[PDB]
Amino acid sequence: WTAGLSSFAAIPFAQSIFYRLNGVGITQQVLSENQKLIANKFNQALGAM
Amino acid sequence: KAQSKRSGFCGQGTHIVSFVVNAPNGLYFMHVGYYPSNHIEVVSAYGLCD
Amino acid sequence: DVLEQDAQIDRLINGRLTTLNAFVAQQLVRSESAALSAQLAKDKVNECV
């Protein structure tokens, strides 16, 4: 979680990826919630590796 | 010069202030380290939407 | 003959110890490089991971 600093959290890993992605790239929640395959695209890259 | 507020390059944990004094044939550092030493589980909400 | 063999043993011992000294020196350099790389690794884990 971007908001949490040096603290334990109980969130799904995909939600944690979204918080990091929002900080890394300025994409609005509507833009992030479009195809919803953004995490799947990461999985395809991980599978190729 | 300033609190690190980042990865702990200096004292373990958050480092409030660090003081440096000369050492024989070198420099000795005395950073201050904050340790929680206790954790209590609290259920929390992501604010609210209206 | 034993007297000549003892002289041959002497030079062989001198060669072996010098080769061991070079091997130990290389290991000492490797350990110093490992300490620097381990410090880099700890910083990398905290900064990126």
Cα distance from C20 to chain B (closest Cα, Å)?
Answer: 32
Q: How far apart are the first and last CA of chain C?
A: 68
Element spanning B23, H or E:
strand B14-23
Q: How far apart are CA B12 and CA B39, in angstroms?
A: 17
Set of chain C residues whose Cβ sits within 8 Å of the Cβ of B9: 43
- DSSP three-state, residue B20: strand
The number of CA neighbours under 13 Å toward the Cβ of B23 is 7
- Number of CB atoms found within 10 A of residue A20's CB: 11
For CA atoms B7, B13, B16, B17, give the dihedral sign: negative
The experimental technique behind this entry is: cryo-EM
Q: Strand pairing partners for B28?
A: B21
Q: How far apart are CA C30 and CA C35, in angstroms?
A: 9
Set of chain B residues whose Cβ sits within 8 Å of the Cβ of C47: 6-7
Q: Å resolution of this model?
A: 4.6
Cβ neighbors of B29 (< 8 A, separation 6 or more) are: B10, B18, B19, B20
Q: Strand pairing partners for B26?
A: B23
Retrieve residue A14's tokens.
Answer: 């995909």
Our CA angle for B29, B34, B38, nearest 5°, is 150
Our CA angle for A40, A2, B16, nearest 5°, is 145
